[PDB]
Structures are given as structure tokens and as C-alpha cells.
Design a protein around this ligand. Structure first.
Ligand SMILES: *[C@@H]1O[C@H](CO)[C@@H](O[C@@H]2O[C@H](CO)[C@@H](O[C@@H]3O[C@H](CO[C@H]4O[C@H](CO[C@H]5O[C@H](CO)[C@@H](O)[C@H](O)[C@@H]5O)[C@@H](O)[C@H](O)[C@@H]4O)[C@@H](O)[C@H](O[C@H]4O[C@H](CO)[C@@H](O)[C@H](O)[C@@H]4O[C@H]4O[C@H](CO)[C@@H](O)[C@H](O)[C@@H]4O)[C@@H]3O)[C@H](O)[C@H]2NC(C)=O)[C@H](O)[C@H]1NC(C)=O
Ligand SMILES: *[C@@H]1O[C@H](CO)[C@@H](O[C@@H]2O[C@H](CO)[C@@H](O[C@@H]3O[C@H](CO)[C@@H](O)[C@H](O)[C@@H]3O)[C@H](O)[C@H]2NC(C)=O)[C@H](O)[C@H]1NC(C)=O
Ligand SMILES: *[C@@H]1O[C@H](CO)[C@@H](O[C@@H]2O[C@H](CO)[C@@H](O[C@@H]3O[C@H](CO)[C@@H](O)[C@H](O)[C@@H]3O)[C@H](O)[C@H]2NC(C)=O)[C@H](O)[C@H]1NC(C)=O
Ligand SMILES: *[C@@H]1O[C@H](CO)[C@@H](O[C@@H]2O[C@H](CO)[C@@H](O)[C@H](O)[C@H]2NC(C)=O)[C@H](O)[C@H]1NC(C)=O
Ligand SMILES: *[C@@H]1O[C@H](CO[C@@H]2O[C@@H](C)[C@@H](O)[C@@H](O)[C@@H]2O)[C@@H](O)[C@H](O)[C@H]1NC(C)=O
Lengths: 468, 145, 467, 143, 142, 467
């Protein structure tokens, strides 16, 4: 009846912990010397065989709203973008008055009202003796009207920031990134087919490396992210609080065919010593506004699904209403995202214009041929200058991509905001698209994961005793 | 591979046989994989002063720190050997009221250590000082005689 | 016969020089206020420090040759440089300045022309328009040029490059713990009175220094550590002259300082997103900054310091306390930072005593506040501060909105024994000193020294190996 | 008992008992181990990229790791790797400090004793390595 | 000092002489140069920069883990002690069906590894798994 | 019956690449050279280098594919970038220049504008006033714009940023011992004769490489190493023409080079304290820079090289030394750095020797020791060095006050074989090459190969576990 203390190494014991993470992408990304990719340069090789040991009889608690990784990688990609554009040209001298024409010409039907602009000006290069008149092309989104003289204009964030162009060579296609942990640490995977994002997760496994995660950043619509399993799942910090954004992960991928149907010649003006400001030269042929293709029935069926889900969450006897963003910065008002590098601001008014009913939401939509579901086309714009989401400062210019651009993203998620307007005895719940926060677009991928250090040391009583 | 995912199982069955085989698997694997990736990347010379490179360097330090602190502790209490060593330290009555079966066949490792946390420092200190000093005195006496 | 026996973990230490890290308290991070020029990087202070005492130990110390002083000196320099380096350079502002001595002759006002409303022409972010913009400066910031009544510039233009501090970063110093990496230790002298160099009666060890607030102050040591039962005077060579004399006080003297001006901070925008911060105007009446000091407290403190100085320079002595001979405003006029703004206070009142051989001993008493009318310090403001060891790299202090309030504790004095031709007179004179971050560091680090711990040990024993 | 190097003022025998406590803190790095865990920030934002303190702290970590690693390597080269205390076959040449064991273990402290032996420290260490090499050659002769 | 001078010699020639003793000295010398260098530079403080400060820091790292990864291997198969240790794993004739004469008095260590390159990982993993069986036997004895 | 036996410390290495660190012995650091090429970071070298001989070893060597050549290339690039990083950018001096002829016509004066006293307008720290002034420029630095018989600029100003090298930082080469970390080793091929890549029978091993002076030189190799008993030719593929030809000499040819002028070092204040350095004037006659080569010695060496080139391409072929075809200034004319000052020396005299296999005969010396023993290289001077890899990042060399005198050791060549139509003629036309620093380092690191150390080993033995 004598019990002595026995040391056991490698006990299955972990505790909550926050640590450094390191990227691992693909050997193929290194192949072909792509280089321009601003994120795979220092990534280690992804292990071809993943390790996903399953945990049995475990009910680990999870708080995706209090996830370290989210903030960790948020500042990681915030700094990673900064380091990529840090050696690139700072477009400080461009902050000049601009003489801007109609389009370029009146060679006229006419779906454009200033997108070319043809802003001309007098600028000084590294040669600090001669003014150098020239001209470049800018969408109205980048040219703020000044002086109201008629054609006086300046760059949008000259008096609020410093605009740095990306290095033209730099390609902006995200590739899957597998966060991996240093040894002695593990990632716990909440492998339940239905998680509120809060409370205990029963079905649970673990991985030493996260699954592939493209750091796609997009507002309102999550693109090329991750699909939900069997059912659409909605996660919020506090559903009844209006300020809290609403994560909505779709179980169905929806194809969005976005393109820039303008053949563009690109002109590189030299400004400064070896610094070159890349700008559009002209557009070959007719200019057609950028558009995105959305299946009506597929989208309406997804709408029906999320509507039933929000009714289940709130009141199944409530009316659901879908309006567009009240107002504020363009990113939140209209669906914005990068395509082949150029950024498209699509007026997603039609996407959120349908109101359902507790009495309604009874049937789905069935297309009667292709011309029945003629795909909705979204009025899309192009904004070359983007200020950092966190700070108006350090705005980044986007070099124009020559010729034709076309992408085919798969909508895997949605971001919503509930407005607590005076509709108490109305039950009419309105949800407006939200965004503007990279962290929200990461919470939608990191929720299933959780980092825990491993302390493989353990002690327990045993009748055994060390020999004297 | 070999990650200890048997936290749900109590020390009653897994600790006796299954965990030790898995633990040896994990120790060999977490050594093979980490250093394989390291050697490959070091030869490539892709590792640099880049943001991600300083994250990898920081993690390379953490692995070393964790492994070395663990091995140090083990060697500082004589258990430089395998994962299972029996000390000459008695189990204090202050932590008790649980039968051998309770502790083993009824308490999962995670649940068990979560009640000993208030005494982890005391137990670890009273192991290293007791057995190690006593064994040093014994070796000296035997060598003298 | 004996045999070698390798011992491990043996308590043997050797004086060593190693890198140290900062470990501020958890509360400083809890505020979430942006790093105070040197803060977030630090690791959190261990709840209770271990001050294990080393009984039967007589460890010698050398505060004048300690590495830690130099290491921290370099650390504080680099920390300021990194904090203010991303901020805006005020080089575009080096332009001719048109200034009026006072915006309105509201006579009255104590200032003869301190406001100096300076209006200049600066190219904005839009490199097409010159925009005349007014800004307010103190005389210490504008050099009269061209001998014209209104032609002014900035003290450091051709001389040095000005860089403003980022306004979000505050300046309120916070206690810092220098901890050594394991295998290293810090030894703390426990002797109530320490010369700072030589053997220590009682010695202790800490893996972490006590919290030090890296305040930078001249002619004074503010919010600093205190002595025990007796003011202590330390100098590498007291019989030398250039050697600055460190004094650690045993009693803290409260110093209440405030800039009594309600001020609005105009933010002029200069260049692409770089906004320079100045002063829009002063709301209400303009009152010069000052500091309040007890008469009796200061006199009795001078009494104790004068006794200590007679002890260290012959019992029969007459110590005259005088002011700085001359030179840079940093070391001539006592200066410090209050609420992120630099205050230059003419401490001529503090050291204006000739003293008597036997006049000492009778400590003066406070017969009411009318008697002890608190000493008022004529204080100034120098927004442009220069690097102490570097001609270039000057830094601009952004103004602080509203009225600033400060209440530090005097805890130390820096002095310079002049070698005047008055040995027959025996009139020892001690002018205030300063001008060296190291002198401040030596005052707080005298009791600490860092030693590498060598766990490897050798010893003959009858014990032999097993063949 | 003593938290740290209390037995510094104590003699050879008294300091032997607390050797384990002084040897645990060699690589323990308890102050450095925890990063900004209370605020849930790793390494204070990964050392704020490479801030002045970031560099200092990272450098302090490698020195704790290499210094212990080197000590353990020394233990390994002379055989008694795991054992904190080990006998050696090296006879103690009487030339190094002609003193009786009583004066050493009862009067001389460890700190004061490792000022005498400093002259012959490297000599002694190499003697131990050659004695281990001699032991290995003897083992080969047995085989 | 004490570098692989006997690498041109055969496995047995090298073993009966330098591998057993000179290599032990070589590990000690590796420590001696590190002990002297890592101390003296620590008495400089002009080190620990970037342009060469990172280079030396990375090298010091690489040394650290490159040595630990071998200590770990020694730990996983229990041979954390003597540099030379035997195993209960039988040498399968499938791995190089050659007599001990061709193995030691003929093959040199450098050419030996090249033939066993396919076997290397296989044998290393077999040694640790055999150690697990021995550890289970030790539990039965306990 | 046998069992595998784990062997630690086995003599086995494998080709690998790894980080390598510098080591200078800190002799320069004790002198106080104020950090040259980052000498304050090199760890001191081992007093005694160790080169254990690897008997009965035939290790294959591949100098062309060696990682060290590229690791060093990038590290040297980083060094030259770090040096100019804190220095003063010369963006404002990219303006128009009003220039004279040389200095005056009161002058025989073979120079035809190599001083071109250029004057211009500039904006100093005071960004409101122009400041006309004159500084001196060699023609290589200034390109004329518009050719109105006046108006000049700088060669790379419009297309490339210039950074003036800091004067405090010397550019004198110092020996470097690229040392490998523990667990890695450098193999040293000690054969008296090599072909660049190939099996080596005489092999040794070094913990650090031998001291290396990272000198950037074109068409020549200075202060380098010497071959053994015979000139050696090395090339990845001598049979192809595009690849360069590395030659290493067995003996050293002294190269007495000096700028024979007393130069006043004027400094112009540009912007906030940033002083652009130039030449005030040249006291005395403007003697053109020149280099001294022994006529006999250089011929004897050229005949040795010719005989080796004959051996490579058959006795039938005759060797022709034609001058550089053309291209960038460093390729067309031999160019190096003397005492922190960059030279540009016409190499036509050195490469104007045609050798017929029938007429090879012997070596030509001179009983007379007076006259015809000096080959004076007409050297011009260029300060604005274009980057060798990228159009941008051009550097500016400040003038060195007084006469700069140096004396190197010609220790090899960089040559280019052309695909001429004279192949039927059977003549090998070899022309000086350059413009690639990697070839400069291949001339040193050829003898070294980096291999990691794997002490882990397995071996069947009759021994079995002592269970
Ligand atoms: C900080 O603290 C200091 C210390 O308290 C404060 O300053 C002090 O002020 C005191 C006056 O209030 C002053 O005391 C005067 O000292 C003068 C000189 O002191 C020396 O000499 C006297 C006399 O010794 C003589 O005789 C011997 C032989 O026996 C000779 O060897 C000597 O050389 C002398 O010749 C000693 O007593 C002292 O100890 C010193 O050695 C004295 O002259 C003076 O006496 C009177 O005359 C003064 C005018 O000459 C007059 O100002 C003073 O008030 C005295 O007046 C007398 O008469 C009136 C009317 O009857 C009566 O009311 C008085 O009470 C008094 O009897 C004093 O003795 C201290 O020397 C002085 N100390 C210092 C360091 O300055 C200071 O205020 C305080 N500051 C603050 C802000 O609180
Ligand atoms: C937690 O994990 C369990 C186990 O995977 C999940 O239960 C599984 O649920 C699926 C359906 O959702 C079951 O599939 C069904 O299998 C039966 C036969 O077993 C078949 O007749 C059906 O047609 C269907 O294929 C599956 O069997 C079932 N597994 C077990 C072991 O019961 C559970 O859904 C998970 N819960 C959460 C919240 O993630
Ligand atoms: C440097 O000089 C060496 C010779 O000292 C050159 O190496 C030799 O090149 C030949 C052909 O390139 C190699 O091939 C040989 O071909 C015959 C064909 O019958 C074959 O029988 C040989 O045994 C061999 O395969 C030869 O292996 C190679 N080495 C030797 C030792 O001859 C080399 O090409 C020159 N250049 C460089 C860069 O090394
Ligand atoms: C998701 O479901 C879980 C489980 O029902 C919810 O967690 C519970 O919250 C209620 C309070 O609202 C508690 O009374 C229960 O004890 C909790 N259960 C456990 C053990 O987690 C969770 O709040 C739901 N979250 C959302 C977003 O709806
Ligand atoms: C070189 O080529 C020779 C061809 O005949 C030669 O033609 C000329 C060059 C004459 O001057 C004479 O050398 C020969 O008649 C071959 O005969 C010869 O073998 C080839 N190789 C050598 C070793 O020279």
C-alpha cells in the first residue's frame, strides 16, 4: 500500500497557448521561378502526406472569437504586404494638378463617362531642372475633383497618405498556405459538421499544419475560401448585438465570372532615378464595363437557405429583409476584391434586394433553360489606388494589367450586419453586407483550428520505487 | 504522425502500453520531419531575413527551447533514460483521496494533471533534489569503500 | 590518493558581459496605450522577484566599470532612434520665418516675445501651391538670422536634420526590469551605505533588476531610487575635478511642475501624408511654466549633502553651492520632460548659498506656508531637442493639447567639483552637472553587477571510477 | 531552502546538496519562457518584427541554449553526460594546491576554491578526456 | 583540429584507431573552439547585428539543431551515452550480403554509406522500434 | 551472424550548402579603421589554421557549381549595400552643369578636359536660396547634354540613383577567412595542377578558408593567390567561346599605381548637414594617373600563358592577344580600386602581343637594367561607379585628399576566346574579360568544396545487446 511518484514523458496533455506560426505552401510554386508571388518566398515545403490523428472521447472548448492565430496572421499578412511594396516606387511626385479630358476622345455607343479620363499634367523626374508634361489614364474612382475649375483634378489620397505603386512584376494570385507549428505545439481541428464557433466541439481531430488557406481578401463575398459541410452555418460574436458582424459560410460554391473586357496597351512613364510609374497607355477597340456573371436560381436558392437559417437562429415566425450597405467607405458599400491583380468594385445591389417571409420561404427556384436564368451582370468599376484598411496612410497604387483579364472565383461565404431599426412589432429583420475587416475574413477559416502547446511531462503515483 | 490523440482514454489502459509506443513514434517523427524540412530548405537557401524567415527562425528557437528544457528537467532528475522512470519520492497525503484505480482507470491524463497543478512545482522540486542528491551520496560512499 | 570529481550546478560565478532584455510590468501592456518609446517588446515582470541573499559573501563591486551602464546607454539611444525614425522629418520646414514677438500687445504678459507667432510659406503635399501657414515657437527654437527684426529660422537646420516624434507614442516613462538570460545573474549590494566601488558587506542576487524608470534629467535625478538613512556621494575620483559627482538622496523632495497654458495643437500638413504638429493658439491668459519647491526641505537636504561633502573633503570645510559655469542649455539650465514636453527651468535659486563653517546643524523650520513660500522655478520650453552625443539627428517634440501637470520626486543630484585656485580659502564649490545618460544609469545601477554562472566544477575526492 | 546560489558563502559539502536547484535554472529561462501570454500576444508581436528589444531577447535565448548545450556536450565527451556528479579515473595530481580534504570541504567555499584551480582548469579537463580515451582503448583490448 | 584524417582508411583501420578516440577529441575540440569564440565575441557586443550578425547567428542555430537532431536520434534508440553502442536489431543479409572482411577491411566509411543509402532510414527506424520491444520487456521485468 | 551497431563520430561527409561567417582576426579592429567592409562583425580567426591531410582520398571537385562563389557574391553585394545605405543620396546634384575646360589655360598639358571645372546652381538645407559653386569632375563622370558646345550632366543621374560612399569608411581590402560552422567542413584540393573541376588526389580539410581579400578588379587579378610551379588555365568549357577564361599566375607582377596630384578635398553642404565631398583643386602639375609594369617580366609571363594556351588548343594553333572588343568601361579598359580610389587604365599595351608557334623560341630578358623596363598604363579616373548587376544603385567615390599610391600583385587574368573566321587560319584570339564578380571569387574558392559532417553511422558487428 505504498505509492511513489513516477515521471512519465509523452503524456497526451496539452494546454491553451499562443505561439509563432510559419508558412508552408508548395514545391510547384517554387518551380518556374515565379518570384513575383509576394508570399511563397520564405515558405517551407508542405508535407505531401498530412497528419490528422483523430481524438476520441474528447469535447475540447473552442473560441474562434478569441483566437490568437487570427490576429497573428492578420498582422503577418498586413506586414507581408508592406514588405512586398516597401522596395517599390513611392508615387509621391504624382501629387499634381491634372488636366483631364472627356474619355480620351469623342470618337463615338458610349457606356463610359470619364473612366479613361486622360489626365495630363506637368511632372518632374530625377532631372530636377526640366518640367516634363505628359499624360496617363485613371478611372474616376482614383481622381478626386479639385478646384471645381472644370477639369482640375488630383489623386484621391494625396492630402491624406503616401501612394506607393506595387512593383509591376509582383503577381497577386494567392496560393494555399499551410500554417505549421513548432514542435511541442499542435493545432486542434474542430471536425464537427456543425459548429456555432463557440462552446465545446465533440468530433475533434488535430493537425501539425493547417489546411491550405489562400489569403484572399474580399468584402461582402468570401471567395476561394472553404465550404461548409452539409448545411450553411452562421457564426456571430453576439447575434442580438447589431455592431457584431455575421459570418455566413455557404455549403455550395457559386461561380462568379468576373472579367475586364478591355484590351489595354500599358505605358511606363519614367519618373525619378530608375523609378518608373506604370500606367495605362490606351484601350484597343471598344471599352466594355467590367461585369460578373451570377446564376439567378443558384443565388436565390442560397438566399432561401441563409434566410431559413437566420429565421431558425432568431424567430422562425419573422420576416427577413435584405438591403444593401447603408453607407461609408466603398469597400463596405459594394462587393470589392482583386482579380488577376486589378481590383473590381461591383455594385452588388441586386445581390441583396430580395425580402422573404416566415409565411414564405416555402419553395426553391428552378431554371427553365439558360435564357430563363439569364446570369445577372454586376456593374463593376476599377479602383487603382487602395488605402490600407487599418490606416488611410500608405495607400497602394495598382499597376494596370495589359490586355484582357478574366477570373472565375467560387463564392464560399458571406459577411452580414444586422441593423436594429425600429421594427419591433414588425419582426422584419434586415441584414446588410459587411466587411472592411481582414480579421473577419480569417475568422471564417481559422475557426475550426486552435493552437495548444504540448507539455509531455506527467507524474502519477505507482507502487514502483527507485532502487537504492 | 504518431501524435498522442489518446487524451480521452484514461492512464489505465493507454498509459501501460499504447501511449509508450505512440510516444516513441512521435519523438522519432517530430525529429525526422522537422529536421528533414530544415535540411531541404537550408540547401535551397530560400531561408532569408524576410518576414516569414524571421518567423521560421523564431520557431526554430522555440523547438530547441522546449526540447532542451524537457531533456534538462529529465536529466536533472536522473531520468535521462526512457520515458518511464520510477522515483523514490513518496506520494504526500495532502494530494490523495483517489484510489490507484480512480487515478488510472477513471481519470484521463488531462483531467488528472489539472488537479495537481497547484502542486506541480512542489512535486517537481522534491523529486529532483531528493533522489539526485541521495544517489550522488551513495555513489560517493561506494567509490570510497 | 585523490581523484578529480566533475561537479555540475556548482554556485561559482565569474564577472561577465552579456546582453540583457527589458521586462516591464504587465499593467503597462494592460493600458493598450501605444508603446511609450520602449515598452511592448518587453516581456512581463514575474509577479514576485526572487531576492535570494548571499550570506557569508563579500563580493567586490565596480559601478564605474560596469558593462550594464554602457549596454543600457546604447539601448536607450537605439530605442529613441527606432521610435522616432518612422515619424515625419521636418527638413522641408527649414524656411525663412516671418514672426511677430506677440500676436497682440495685451499690456500684462510676463513673456517679452516667447510666443513668436511665426508664419512661413511651405509647399504642401500638392507640389504646386505655396501655402502661407502660421505656427507658434519659443525663442529657444528660432535663431534670429540676417539681423532683420523678423527674419527667423530653426536652431538645427544646416547643423542637423529635425525629426518630429510620432504623436501617438507617449513619453510617460515606465519601470523597466533588466533580466539576464539563464546561466547569468545580477548581484545586488545590500550595504545600507555603498561607495559604489569595492567589497560589499551583504550581497544578494536577482535574475531581474528592480523596476527602473529610464527618465532622462539634468542637474537632478527625478522619479529615481532612494538611499538608506543617509545621503550617499559617489565619484570614481573625488580628488579629480572633471569627474562628475553622483549624489543619491535618502529623502524624496516633491517637485510640482506645470505649463499653465490651455493650448490648441494646429496640425499643418506638409508633403504626402506627413502632417507636422504645432500650436494653433493659447486659450485664456498666458502663464510661464514653473515648478514649486519647499524652502525648508531643500535647505535641510543641502545641509545633509554639505555635511557629506565636508566628510569626503576634510572636516574643516566651507562648501559654496553655485550654478553651472556655462555652455549648452542642457547642462547649464536644469531640464527634464513633463508630459512629453521638455521643460528648461533656471535652477539658479536652488544653488545660491555661500554657507558658514558652523552655520550648518540648525535645520530651519516651516513656520507656515507664508514662511515656506514654495520656490518658483522660471521654466522655459525647447520643442527642438538635440541628440546628447550626436551633433545631427535633432528631434522635434510635438506640442501637447491642454495644460500639462507633473509631480516627480527629486531623488538625486549631479555635481562638478571645480578646481579653482582657492585651496587656501578651503571654499569647495560644486556646480550642477549632467549631460550624460550614463551618469543617470550609474546612479541607479551602482548596486547591480552581472556575473556568468559556471555550473562546471572540479574537486579531488577518494572516489574512483568503475573498471 | 536557499532559492538560488545561497550556498555561495557555504563550503564544498554544504553547496553539494543545493546543486540540483542551481542546475535546474541553467536552462529553465522561466522569465523568458512565457512571452506575452497574459495579453495573448506571441513574443510581443513576434518581437515586433525586429525591434531593438526583439533582437536583444532573441540573442539572449541562443546564449542560454548554446551555453547549456556546450555544458552538456562537455559532460557527454567525458562520459558522465546524464550524471550531474561523476567520479573520474584521473588521479588528482598532488601538485594542484597541497590541501587536506577537511580544509576544502569544511573551510574553502566553491567560489574561492575556483580561483586557485583556474590555472590548471583546462589541463584537468583534457586529462579527463584522455582518461576516457584510455578507458575506450582498454575496452577495445577486452574485445 | 582532430578532423576526419582516417576517412581515406578502411572501416576497420579507421575504427581500431581514430573513430574511437580522435572523434571524441573532435567533439571536444568543436566545443573548445565554440567555447572560446562564443565567449570572446560576447566580450565584443559589436556582434549580433544583421550584415554578418545574422550570418553568424544563423550558423550558431544550425550548429545547435544539427547537433540536437543527433542527440534526439540517440535518445529515440536509447544510445544517448557511449558514441559506440550495439543494437538487438539483426543485420539482415538483404542489406549488403557481403562478408565482414569486405565490410570492414575493404569498404571505407565514405563508400560504405553510399551502398547503405537506401537502408540508412530503414535501419534507423528499425533500431528505435526494437528499443520499444526492449522497453516493454523492461516493464515486464519491473 | 551480425547485428547493426550505431557508430557516432564516423569520417563521412556529404556535399551541402550552408551559411558561412567572416573572420578577420580583428587586427583591423584593434587598429581602429572605423569598420571597413564590416570588420567589426568578423569573429577573430583561430591563431593556428589546421589542414589535416586526407590520404588515399579522390574527392571530386566542381569549382564552377560551388555554392560559396554565389553565397560570397550575395554577401559581398550586401556588404557594399550596407556601406552606402546610411550614406548621403545625391538626388539634388542631378542637375545641369556649366563647365570650363580643365582649370585654366595658364598651362605639356596633354589633358583635354579631365578636370572640366563644372559650376551650377543647387539647393542646400535652406530650401529657399540657390547657391552657385564649382566642383571638379573627370570626363568619365559627366555626359554632355544637347551638345550646344556646353551643358553637362552625370552619366547615370537620370536612369540611376547615386549614393556617395561615406569617407569615414575606408575601402581598403582586408583578408577574410570564410569559416564554416561546426558540423560542416571545407575540403581543400591540394593538387599542384587542376582543370577547374575534376577528381583531386591531394586533398586536405580546413575549419576556415585561408585569408581572402575580396578585391573587385577587371581584366586582371590583384592581391590574389599564386598557382604552384606553373600557370594554370581554368574554364567551364574552353571548347565554347562564350564562357570566360580564368588564368592564375605562378609568380606575382608588381603594379605600381598612383595618382600623382595633390588634391584639395572641398566639401559642399547639401541638404540638412549632408556634406557632398568633391575636389577643391589640384596643387601643382596635373600629372595623369599611371601604372608601372616590368616590360621583360610581363612578356615572360605572357609567353608562359601562351604556351599553356597552346597546350590547351594544339601546337598547330598560334596565340594572339588582341585588346578588349568593346562595351562597358570596366570591360573595355582594366579598372580597379587604389587606396579607396577607383582607377581606369588603358590595357592596350599589356594585350598587344602575337605569338607564332614556329617563332615561340624562348623568353626575352635584358642585360641592361636601365630603360624599356616600365610599361606606363595611361589611367583615367572615374568616381561614379555603375552597379555591375543592376542599372540602378550607382555609387559615388569621394576624392581622396593628396596623392594616392598603391602597389598590387598581378596574380592572374580573365580572358575571352572569340568565334573568329580565323579558325581556318588556326589562331586563338584571346581578349581581356570582366564585369562578373563571381569569376573574381571563382579564382579564390576553386580549391574549396563545402561538405556537411554526419557523425551518425551503422555497421554490422558480431556484438549484440548486453541484455
Ligand atoms: C538654511 O540653514 C542655514 C543654517 O541655519 C540658515 O542660515 C543661517 O542663519 C543664521 C542666522 O539666522 C546664521 O547664524 C549667524 O552666524 C553668523 C556667523 O556664524 C559663525 O560665527 C558665529 C559667532 O562666532 C564668532 O565667535 C567665534 C569665537 O567664539 C569666532 O571664532 C567666530 O569666527 C565668530 O567671530 C557662530 O555662532 C556660528 O556658529 C558661526 O561659527 C553670526 O555672525 C550670527 O550672529 C549674529 O550676527 C549676525 C550679523 O553679524 C546676524 O545676521 C545674526 O542674526 C545674529 O544676530 C544676533 O543678534 C540678534 C539681535 O540680538 C539675535 O536676535 C540673534 O538671535 C543673534 O543672537 C549668527 O550666529 C548661520 O550662520 C546661517 N547658516 C548658514 C549655513 O548660512 C539659512 O537661513 C537656511 N535657509 C533657509 C532657506 O531656511
Ligand atoms: C460526429 O461524428 C459522427 C461519426 O462520424 C457523426 O455521425 C455520423 O452521421 C452520419 C450522417 O450525418 C451517419 O451516416 C449514416 O450512416 C448510416 C449507417 O451508419 C446510413 O444508414 C446513413 O445512410 C448515413 O450514411 C454516420 O453513420 C454517423 N456515424 C456514426 C458513428 O454514428 C455525427 O454526425 C458527427 N456530429 C457532428 C456534430 O459533427
Ligand atoms: C579538364 O581536364 C580533364 C582531364 O584532365 C577533362 O576530363 C575528361 O574529359 C573527358 C571528355 O570530356 C572525359 O571522358 C572520357 O571519355 C573516354 C571516351 O572513351 C572514356 O573512355 C574515358 O574513360 C572518359 O569517360 C573524362 O572522364 C574526363 N576526365 C578524365 C580524368 O579524363 C575535363 O573535360 C576538363 N575540363 C573540366 C571542366 O574538367
Ligand atoms: C451554440 O450552441 C451551444 C450549445 O447549445 C451554445 O452554448 C450554450 O449556451 C447557453 C446559453 O445561451 C448555455 O446555457 C449552455 O450551457 C451552453 N452550452 C454549452 C455547453 O456550450 C452556444 O451559445 C450557441 N452559440 C450560438 C452562436 O448560438
Ligand atoms: C595540328 O595540325 C597539324 C596539321 O598540319 C600542320 O599544318 C600547319 C599548322 C603546319 O605548320 C604544321 O604544324 C603541320 O603540317 C597536324 O599535323 C598536327 O598534328 C596538329 N597538332 C599539333 C600537335 O600540332
Amino acid at each position: 500500500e505504498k505509492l511513489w511518484v513516477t515521471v512519465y514523458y509523452g503524456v497526451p496533455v496539452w494546454k491553451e497557448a499562443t505561439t509563432t506560426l510559419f508558412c508552408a505552401s508548395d514545391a510547384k510554386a517554387y518551380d518556374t521561378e515565379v518570384h513575383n508571388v509576394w508570399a511563397t518566398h520564405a515558405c517551407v515545403p508542405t508535407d505531401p502526406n498530412p497528419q490528422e490523428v483523430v481524438l476520441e472521447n474528447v469535447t475540447e472548448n473552442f473560441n474562434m472569437w478569441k483566437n490568437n492565430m487570427v490576429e497573428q496572421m492578420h498582422e503577418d499578412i498586413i506586414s507581408l504586404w508592406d514588405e512586398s511594396l516597401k522596395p517599390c516606387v513611392k508615387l509621391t511626385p504624382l501629387c499634381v494638378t491634372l488636366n483631364c479630358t472627356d474619355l480620351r476622345n469623342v470618337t463615338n455607343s458610349e457606356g463610359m463617362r470619364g473612366e479613361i479620363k486622360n489626365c495630363s499634367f506637368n511632372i518632374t523626374t530625377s532631372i530636377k531642372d526640366k518640367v516634363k508634361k505628359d499624360y496617363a489614364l485613371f478611372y474616376k474612382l482614383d481622381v478626386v475633383p479639385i478646384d471645381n475649375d472644370n477639369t482640375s483634378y488630383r489623386l484621391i489620397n494625396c492630402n491624406t497618405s503616401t501612394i506607393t505603386q506595387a512593383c509591376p512584376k509582383v503577381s497577386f494570385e494567392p496560393i494555399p498556405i499551410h500554417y505549421c507549428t513548432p514542435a511541442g505545439f499542435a493545432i486542434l481541428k474542430c471536425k464537427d459538421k456543425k459548429f456555432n464557433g463557440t462552446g465545446p466541439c465533440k468530433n475533434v481531430s488535430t493537425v501539425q499544419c493547417t489546411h491550405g488557406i489562400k489569403p484572399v481578401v474580399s468584402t461582402q463575398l468570401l471567395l476561394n475560401g472553404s465550404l461548409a459541410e452539409e448545411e450553411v452555418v452562421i457564426r456571430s460574436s453576439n447575434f442580438t448585438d447589431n455592431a457584431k458582424n455575421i459570418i455566413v459560410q455557404l455549403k455550395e460554391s457559386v461561380e462568379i465570372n468576373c472579367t475586364r473586357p478591355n484590351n489595354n496597351t500599358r505605358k511606363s512613364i519614367h519618373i525619378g532615378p530608375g523609378k518608373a510609374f506604370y500606367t495605362t497607355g490606351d484601350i484597343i477597340g471598344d471599352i466594355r464595363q467590367a461585369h460578373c456573371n451570377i446564376s439567378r436560381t443558384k443565388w436565390n436558392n442560397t438566399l432561401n437557405q441563409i434566410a431559413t437559417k437566420l429565421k431558425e437562429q432568431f424567430g422562425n415566425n419573422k420576416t427577413i429583409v435584405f438591403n444593401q450597405s447603408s453607407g461609408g467607405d466603398p469597400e463596405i458599400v459594394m462587393h470589392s476584391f482583386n482579380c488577376g491583380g486589378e481590383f473590381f468594385y461591383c455594385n452588388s445591389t441586386q445581390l441583396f434586394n430580395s425580402t422573404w417571409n416566415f409565411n414564405g420561404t416555402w419553395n426553391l427556384t428552378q431554371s427553365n433553360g439558360t435564357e430563363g436564368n439569364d446570369t445577372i451582370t454586376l456593374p463593376c468599376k476599377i479602383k487603382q489606388i487602395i488605402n490600407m484598411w487599418q490606416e488611410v496612410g500608405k495607400a497602394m497604387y495598382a499597376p494596370p494589367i495589359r490586355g484582357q483579364i478574366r477570373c472565375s472565383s467560387n463564392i464560399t461565404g458571406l459577411i452580414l450586419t444586422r441593423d436594429g431599426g425600429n421594427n419591433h412589432n414588425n419582426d422584419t429583420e434586415t441584414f446588410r453586407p459587411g466587411g472592411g475587416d481582414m480579421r473577419d475574413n480569417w475568422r471564417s477559416e481559422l475557426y475550426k483550428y486552435k493552437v495548444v502547446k504540448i507539455e509531455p511531462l506527467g507524474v502519477a503515483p505507482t507502487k514502483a520505487k527507485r532502487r537504492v | 504522425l504518431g501524435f498522442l490523440g489518446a487524451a480521452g482514454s484514461t492512464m489505465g489502459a493507454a498509459s501501460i502500453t499504447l501511449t509508450v509506443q505512440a510516444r516513441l513514434l512521435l519523438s522519432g517523427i517530430v525529429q525526422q520531419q522537422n529536421n528533414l524540412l530544415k535540411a531541404i530548405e537550408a540547401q535551397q537557401h530560400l531561408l532569408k531575413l524576410t518576414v516569414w524567415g524571421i518567423k521560421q527562425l523564431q520557431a526554430r528557437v522555440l523547438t530547441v527551447e522546449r526540447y532542451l528544457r524537457d531533456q534538462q528537467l529529465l536529466g536533472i532528475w536522473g531520468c535521462s533514460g526512457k520515458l518511464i522512470c520510477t522515483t523514490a519520492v513518496p506520494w504526500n497525503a495532502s494530494w490523495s483521496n483517489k484510489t490507484l484505480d480512480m487515478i488510472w482507470n477513471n481519470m484521463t491524463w488531462m483531467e488528472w494533471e489539472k488537479e495537481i497543478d497547484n502542486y506541480t512545482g512542489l512535486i517537481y522540486t522534491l523529486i529532483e533534489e531528493s533522489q539526485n542528491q541521495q544517489e550522488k551520496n551513495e555513489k560517493e560512499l561506494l567509490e570510497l569503500d
